[PDB]
Design an enzyme around this catalytic site. Structure first.
Site, short mmCIF file in Angstrom:
data_model
loop_
_atom_site.label_atom_id
_atom_site.label_comp_id
_atom_site.label_asym_id
_atom_site.label_seq_id
_atom_site.Cartn_x
_atom_site.Cartn_y
_atom_site.Cartn_z
N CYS B 97 38.64 41.23 51.74
CA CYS B 97 39.15 39.78 50.79
C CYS B 97 39.87 38.89 52.20
CB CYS B 97 40.04 40.62 49.78
SG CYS B 97 41.15 38.77 49.03
N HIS B 116 32.62 32.49 51.50
CA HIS B 116 33.72 33.30 51.86
C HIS B 116 33.98 34.19 50.24
CE1 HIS B 116 35.19 30.23 54.83
NE2 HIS B 116 34.60 31.45 55.38
N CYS B 119 39.32 38.74 46.38
CA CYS B 119 39.56 39.74 45.49
C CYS B 119 39.60 39.29 44.30
CB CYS B 119 39.68 41.25 45.64
SG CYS B 119 42.04 40.86 45.26
N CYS B 122 43.63 38.61 44.50
CA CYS B 122 43.87 37.43 44.51
C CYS B 122 43.84 36.28 44.41
CB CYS B 122 43.18 37.50 46.32
SG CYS B 122 44.31 38.90 47.01
N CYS B 224 57.50 1.08 29.24
CA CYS B 224 57.38 1.02 30.68
C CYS B 224 56.42 1.76 31.36
CB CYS B 224 58.47 -0.44 31.49
SG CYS B 224 58.20 -0.02 32.66
N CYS B 263 8.09 55.11 44.97
CA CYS B 263 8.30 54.84 43.02
C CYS B 263 8.29 56.78 42.32
CB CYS B 263 6.35 54.30 43.37
SG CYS B 263 5.63 54.53 41.17
N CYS B 276 16.34 41.34 42.46
CA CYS B 276 15.69 42.43 40.88
C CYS B 276 15.88 43.55 41.23
CB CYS B 276 14.12 41.53 40.89
SG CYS B 276 14.04 41.26 38.54
ZN ZN Z 1 4.07 53.69 41.65
ZN ZN Z 2 42.46 40.14 48.06
ZN ZN Z 3 59.93 0.06 33.92
ZN ZN Z 4 34.91 29.14 51.82
#
Ligand code: ZN
Ligand code: ZN
Ligand code: ZN
Ligand code: ZN
Ligand code: ZN
Ligand code: ZN
Ligand code: ZN
Ligand code: ZN
Lengths: 74, 310
Positions: B97, B116, B119, B122, B224, B263, B276
């Site tokens: 952090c 940047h 956490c 923070c 005013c 696989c 993904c």
């Molecule tokens: Zn496969």
């Molecule tokens: Zn932090």
């Molecule tokens: Zn005034």
């Molecule tokens: Zn930054």
């Protein structure tokens, strides 16, 4: 879904809307509830003034969330 | 459980929680859209019509995917959606952090050039101290936000729902302060009457402002704009007497500061796609769908919990 429109005073207006509703449509529903013409209304979400041609979903405004209403004095 | 996604649950939980990703066809709005391949990054789930595939529902020519998030702490109504917080990440890289130098999880990753990381404890502190001191930054296009703690350029948080970290009461205060700040930046004024504070956007060249509206909207105080006392024709009489990150840590707290699994079916090895976690075996005679993280066959659990990682 419901949104809440609040003045900076704390006064609350409950509206039934859809994410697809334009800010102009939201203002129409405010006109209907409080009788403020849309021209005199400025709506703010999280410090951002909302544009009339944009939708609620454009600003990612969620159900039950609160828009702030401010008055344009000409 | 490995959770890739964090959301804000607005009841029942009322807190930042692990989220479940799901997909539906954008046309019929049923969970019938099978993707050619799974999302690999946040852009894939946040930008409309970016991902495509096939609706399994036959009474539909739908091809476009609509992604949505639900809270992972309980079962939800199918439409009971929660806002995703795309900046929050599980600390799978063990990044320190920027403020407390600890390796905590989850973390928030700023979209500065350095990327940047801070956490969530923070980040909360940052938000609370900056909200109490009215040091949040207003941008006409972005709203009331905070930049990277390192003060990096072009690093204001764009998704303002991240401030849900503050909790319900403080979030409302944040939105209140944000509205007030929006008014002031537009050259507007707040009604100075105690218990009012209505936001008013008058003509720029007007000194007399009235808190207009009925007994429902305004309080009728005429003030005013200069001294914020009741309107007067003299000079203003009111007087207000004014009583009144380490570079090494920042270097280390960067998001971009082995990986072969066979696989399960065909056993041909594969390395990560980066994002993904949904593997479709590229071997033409296998095509087993499996999860990188868990080494198991693809399922709705891995789907919701960690379709993609960062
Ligand atoms: Zn496969
Ligand atoms: Zn932090
Ligand atoms: Zn005034
Ligand atoms: Zn930054
Ligand atoms: Zn929840
Ligand atoms: Zn469909
Ligand atoms: Zn007032
Ligand atoms: Zn898995």
């Amino acid at each position: 879904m419901q949104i809440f429109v609040k003045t900076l005073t704390g006064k609350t207006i409950t509206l039934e809307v859809e994410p697809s509703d334009t800010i102009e449509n939201v203002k129409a529903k405010i006109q209907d509830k409080e009788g403020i013409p849309p021209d005199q209304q400025r709506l703010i979400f999280a410090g951002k003034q909302l544009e009339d041609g944009r939708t609620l979903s454009d600003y990612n405004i969620q159900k039950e969330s609160t828009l702030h209403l401010v008055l344009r004095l000409r | 459980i490995y959770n890739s996604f964090y959301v804000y649950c607005k009841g029942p939980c009322q807190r930042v929680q692990p989220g479940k990703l799901d997909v539906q066809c954008s046309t019929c709005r049923q969970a019938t859209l099978t993707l050619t391949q799974g999302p690999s990054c946040w852009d894939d789930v946040l930008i409309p019509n970016r991902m495509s595939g096939e609706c399994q529902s036959p009474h539909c020519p739908g091809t476009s995917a609509e992604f949505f998030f639900n809270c992972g702490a309980h079962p939800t109504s199918d439409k009971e959606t929660s806002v995703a917080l795309h900046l929050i990440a599980t600390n799978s890289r063990n990044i320190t952090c920027i403020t407390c130098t600890d390796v905590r999880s989850p973390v928030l990753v700023f979209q500065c050039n350095s990327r940047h990381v801070i956490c969530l404890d923070c980040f909360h502190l940052y938000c609370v101290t900056r909200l109490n001191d009215r040091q949040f930054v207003h941008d006409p296009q972005l709203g009331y936000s905070l930049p990277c703690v390192a003060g990096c350029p072009n690093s204001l948080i764009k998704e303002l729902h991240h401030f849900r970290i503050l909790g319900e009461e403080q979030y409302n205060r944040y939105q209140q302060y944000g509205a007030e700040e929006c008014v002031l930046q537009m050259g507007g004024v707040l009604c100075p009457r105690p218990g009012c504070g209505a936001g008013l956007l008058p003509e720029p060249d007007c000194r007399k402002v009235t808190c207009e509206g009925g007994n429902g909207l305004g309080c009728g105080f005429a003030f005013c704009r200069e001294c914020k006392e009741a309107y007067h024709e003299g000079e203003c009489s009111a007087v207000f007497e004014a009583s009144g990150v380490d570079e090494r840590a920042a270097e280390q707290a960067r998001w971009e500061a082995k990986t072969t699994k066979p696989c399960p079916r065909c056993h041909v090895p594969v390395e990560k796609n980066g994002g993904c976690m949904h593997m479709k075996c590229p071997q033409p005679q296998c095509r087993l769908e499996w999860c990188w993280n868990c080494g198991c066959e693809w399922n709705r659990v891995c789907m919701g919990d960690h379709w993609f990682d960062v």
